[PDB]
């Protein structure tokens, strides 16, 4: 069984490289962040440009939706995160306290907290309602590439250029587990599986790995793509067949069979590094986004 993703829309409008695309949980929007300091909102199904959200003073590396699809948080090189009301476009809060670029962000399922990772090598946990920093974790000894809550909000997984993935107890901020791989390649991305049992981790040696983190055991590895230079997002695609999806530095979208690790599709058409992919929560739809020589977002649709 293999998917058949085909290009359906190309979304242009960002004026520098795109950094991140995410589908709203209610399925109807795509948000995109860019080095052009902007967030844009698009219709998930027809690619209709909806709006631009502005106010960060420098570029944005990541953006994330609240559970109810009403808010976004963005992480910027201006050392802040910003919480936005999606419908109004207004900045509700500015989260200050990181001392360097903010690289990554996520809401917990409750969407009462935001977690962020920074070039300042820390992970911060923030109160959505007040915008105040609740915890600062000395999580790593190099820039933090990714942060993600598990399914119940009780855990955070972080990844860093120091080569480590760490699992943190959200409520206490204390480290529950460190995963080290073999030869400590920088870990450029990490996120829990939907069922909360695994973490999917990208390392800058052209490798994705599926780990059982309680056991500290690698269960699957995925290769064949080029990932040595950028922190490229990776996804569990669960709407049809169970795939692993990732951008690649060869301008392609790679899709792997989660179980057999075989490449099942390569999506051609971006003309620069595919820095970000996202999988639609209910339809077999992939959003992909590329760097400076492309600066567009592409939406692909499959029957499975």
């Amino acid at each position: 069984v293999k998917p058949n993703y085909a290009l359906k829309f190309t979304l242009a409008g960002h004026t520098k490289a795109v950094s991140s695309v995410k589908f709203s949980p209610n399925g109807e929007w795509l948000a995109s962040s860019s080095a052009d300091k902007l967030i844009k909102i698009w219709g998930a199904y027809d690619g209709k440009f909806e709006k631009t959200i502005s106010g960060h003073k420098l570029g944005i590396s990541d953006v994330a939706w609240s559970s109810d699809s009403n808010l976004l948080v963005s992480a910027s090189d201006d050392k802040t995160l910003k919480i936005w009301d999606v419908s109004s476009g207004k900045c509700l809060k500015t989260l200050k306290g990181h001392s360097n670029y903010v690289f990554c962000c996520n809401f917990n399922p409750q969407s009462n907290l935001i977690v962020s990772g920074s070039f300042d090598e820390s992970v911060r946990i923030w109160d959505v309602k007040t915008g105040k920093c609740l915890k600062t974790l000395p999580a790593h000894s190099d820039p933090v590439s990714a942060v993600h809550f598990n399914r119940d909000g009780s855990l955070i997984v972080s990844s860093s250029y120091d080569g480590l993935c760490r699992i943190w107890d959200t409520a206490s901020g204390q480290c529950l587990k460190t995963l080290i791989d073999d030869d400590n390649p920088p870990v450029s991305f990490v996120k829990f599986s939907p069922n909360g049992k695994y973490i999917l981790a990208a390392t800058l040696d052209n490798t994705l790995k599926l780990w059982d983190y309680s056991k500290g055991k690698c269960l699957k590895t995925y290769t064949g793509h080029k990932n040595e230079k950028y922190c490229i997002f990776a996804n569990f695609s669960v709407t049809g067949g169970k795939w692993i999806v990732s951008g690649s530095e060869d301008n392609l979208v790679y899709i792997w069979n989660l179980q057999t690790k075989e490449i099942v599709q390569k999506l051609q058409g971006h003309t620069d590094v595919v820095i970000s992919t996202a999988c639609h929560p209910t339809e077999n739809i992939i959003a992909s986004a590329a760097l400076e020589n492309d600066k567009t977002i592409k939406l692909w649709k499959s029957d499975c």
């Binding site: 520098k16 795109v18 950094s19 570029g59 590396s61 230079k229 950028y230 760097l291």
Partner: peptide, 6 residues
């Protein structure tokens, strides 16, 4: 920036 590699 995520869009830069150094």
């Amino acid at each position: 920036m995520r869009t830069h590699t150094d």
